[PDB]
Symmetry: D2
Subunit: 158 residues, 4 copies
């Protein structure tokens, strides 16, 4: 029926979407154009985003999720995946997945063309995200965001 045409986004509908200019709240160098495919069609439990990262910019602030899984599939362009210590070049057709607690990561575009990726994530009401380079932990609980310096956390049990 005509009332489910909206669930299909053709390639050219996607191309013409403006998307949002997004800067990560802890990294002014993490700047991207974000086209939320999931929000366009009404998905509420996962995020599916077509992102464009220009040369010299990053995908995020180096981070590790405790409850939300996340993944990235490269569509065009080339980048550098930083994962724990290590750096890995990435290219189109590459996939990276992050099970909970597995590995902190960020992606940079140190190339000469736009890096275009699908970013795929769970959307949960509660999560904990660490930002090791900032020494901060975010507790996110049903819309309440609580950012705490890791030095201020008394760990009673691990």
């Amino acid at each position: 029926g005509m009332d489910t045409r909206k669930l299909l986004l053709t390639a050219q509908e996607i191309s013409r979407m403006k998307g949002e200019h997004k800067v990560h709240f802890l990294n002014p160098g993490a700047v991207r154009v974000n086209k939320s495919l999931g929000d366009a069609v009404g998905l509420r439990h996962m995020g599916i985003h077509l992102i464009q990262i220009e040369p010299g910019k990053e995908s995020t602030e180096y981070h590790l999720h405790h409850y939300e899984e996340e993944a990235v599939y490269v569509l065009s362009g080339k980048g550098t995946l930083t994962m724990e210590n290590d750096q890995y070049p990435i290219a189109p057709g590459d996939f990276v997945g992050f099970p909970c607690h597995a590995a902190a990561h960020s992606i940079s575009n140190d190339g000469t063309e736009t890096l275009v990726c699908l970013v795929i994530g769970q959307r949960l009401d509660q999560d904990v995200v660490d930002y090791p380079n900032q020494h901060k932990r975010l507790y996110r609980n049903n819309g309440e965001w609580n950012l705490v310096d890791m030095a201020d956390i008394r760990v009673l049990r691990e």
Copy 2:
């Protein structure tokens, strides 16, 4: 050990993939590469699928609890969604909020249809198959398939 979370394009080309046939539709045959299982994802499925000409992606279905989406990488297909057909092609995306639309995809083209299928993985779901008139209740490993004519709907 962190290298295991990255699958290069070349590694993905070398993956054998699994031959999969949908339990309710013998024409729903694909070769599936579970990218999420290869890196250890447990709450989402992310699969790279190949559907040959004349075959389908699934049995026409509707989820009550798991969200699902499809992103076309190469080739061409026909999406059947709430009894309407739409041609699909590389770069097209279709997503399914729960209870929104029953669908299936067929490859009536000449070249392989390659897609990424992205879904939630939940311990409990209910899935309708309108052309079979069956509802599947899937509950932690127990699968119960019931003809819709045998379901008595109750009020709260």
Copy 3:
């Protein structure tokens, strides 16, 4: 402050509550006065009920939950607890708990005074409940209640 006083239900408030006359839809003998202490204060994820079962009546239709836990604490009087193929007498201060899939049960009051219990249970958006004596399975899924004769269920897989 004053807006919190409603979270306390004193003994006299409780004894004065009329409660609801509740009859299980699968068992006309399962008739009880139900005082929902949890709904009175605003609990949403648990059910806490003070129930009265008169002599000759029962607590429920014999059933098994697959996802919601349930428990009973006897405050006064006596009853007969049926679990699977076994019957046990119960009396004041006794406690019975039902982990998921553990045992089908019902309680009868075959004594001479009212049987008064606290019934404590989870409230989940999804559950499956079996009524073995009626040959029925109930699938409850956020507001969609689906009752199916057990012979009409094709079991394709089990864990």
Copy 4:
């Protein structure tokens, strides 16, 4: 299975060994705890028969964000403090706490032992406030993080 294991007679309960419990933030919150739920295998609710002696408390004044809790008084008398008001409690009284409704604690200022059933949700994640200590506890699957409220940057609320 052996169904007799799901039934605890009043006598069995009488006989059960109590666990001596002291709240981690309040040395005056001492009780003897009998976990009825654990004794029979319940995993998603806590049902405890507790004994609080004269001069002791049930807890450190607190508020749950995700787990519901309730108390039903079996014998003895106590004083319920809830949102800074005091109420006498006695046998047959019930008090319940929807999430975020009210901070409370119970004190036994009587002369007899205070005996109650404490009924609670058991969740993997919870947030708990202790207003008298100006601390927040983030409990996430076995990791316990205690943070002074002064050290929390609230970036967003609901």
